[PDB]
């Protein structure tokens, strides 16, 4: 994967140039945001289960999905949905820490659409659930870190779509 530091480093390296002032400003910005990123990561790791629970209750429960004939009917299938949401939240936190949506692209999205298309998982409904997770995490962590987390949550949603 790649964080902000490795991203700027690779951008300089690919063209072979040393790190200049314009590049160094980006690393300074990342270092400025690092404290907020760590605080948000700690909060989300503390409230990992609660966030997924609230999002599921606010989006999926009592809808068509959980009722018989839906893709959240059996207990195993419900547990799988919860596990998918756990993946989304955890990897969104990873991407927020790294300041770069590369781990999301190479470990959460490269083939996830194909897997859902094969399994019949409703991508629109899972996008709605991720939106619910975005809202819950934003409320829990604040406007700035909430927006940063929502950036990568929307990244995952766009990748799924």
């Amino acid at each position: 994967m790649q964080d902000a530091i490795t991203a700027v480093i690779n951008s300089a390296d690919v063209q072979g140039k040393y790190l200049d002032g314009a590049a160094m400003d980006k690393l300074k910005s990342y270092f400025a945001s690092g404290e907020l990123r760590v605080r948000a990561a700690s909060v989300i790791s503390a409230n990992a289960a609660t966030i997924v629970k609230e999002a599921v209750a606010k989006s999926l429960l009592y809808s068509d999905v959980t009722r018989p004939g839906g893709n959240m009917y059996t207990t195993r299938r419900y547990a799988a949905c919860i596990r998918d949401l756990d993946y989304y939240l955890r990897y969104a936190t990873y991407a927020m820490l790294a300041g770069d949506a590369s781990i999301l692209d190479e470990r959460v999205l490269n083939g996830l659409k194909e897997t859902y298309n094969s399994l019949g998982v409703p991508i629109s409904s899972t996008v709605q659930a991720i939106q619910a997770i975005k809202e819950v995490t934003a409320s829990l962590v604040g406007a700035d870190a909430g927006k940063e987390m929502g950036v990568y949550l929307d990244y995952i949603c766009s990748g799924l779509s």
Partner: protein, 169 residues
């Protein structure tokens, strides 16, 4: 896999329905025919290898080129491979007859047969022809035997033919 009971249970669970009168009737029909299913399974277990040998020893005369050069049973290695495939078919037909369901027949036989046989150049027409010959031998043997019910035996081989055959029309 899923036998008839399991597939009916899955179907009713899909709509979240309790077992109704029609479900009870189908379950009763399967449970009453279970004796004949077990009897046919015992017969085929007793005469399995001989039935497959007879099936091949009619199929290669129906299609002589499968033992001539460039046919896909030429070697003794190829001949044993063909016999192994036919024994596989008989064993899964036995399994399907006891299960009263073709789900096992699909999960463990048909789900990649055309892929594998095309990868190995193995014809998919003589295969089903040998399967039908095995079914005819099985039906004749069961009819000779004291089996009151034997119509179910044609189901697994017919499903094999339908799924593994080419859609001619």
């Amino acid at each position: 896999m899923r036998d008839a009971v399991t597939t009916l249970i899955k179907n009713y669970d899909l709509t979240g329905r309790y077992l109704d009168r029609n479900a009870m009737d189908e379950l009763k029909a399967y449970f009453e025919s279970g004796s004949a299913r077990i009897a046919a399974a015992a017969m085929i277990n007793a005469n399995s290898a001989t039935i497959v040998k007879r099936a091949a020893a009619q199929l290669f005369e129906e299609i002589p080129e499968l033992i001539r050069p460039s046919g896909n049973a030429y070697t003794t290695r190829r001949f044993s491979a063909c016999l192994r495939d036919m024994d596989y078919y008989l064993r899964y037909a036995s399994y399907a007859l006891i299960a009263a369901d073709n789900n096992v027949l699909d999960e463990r036989v048909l789900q990649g047969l055309r892929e594998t046989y095309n990868s190995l150049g193995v014809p998919i027409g003589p295969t089903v022809r040998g399967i039908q010959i095995m079914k005819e031998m099985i039906e004749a043997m069961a009819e000779d035997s004291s089996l009151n019910s034997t119509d179910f035996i044609a189901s697994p081989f017919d499903h094999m033919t339908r799924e593994l055959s080419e859609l001619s029309v």
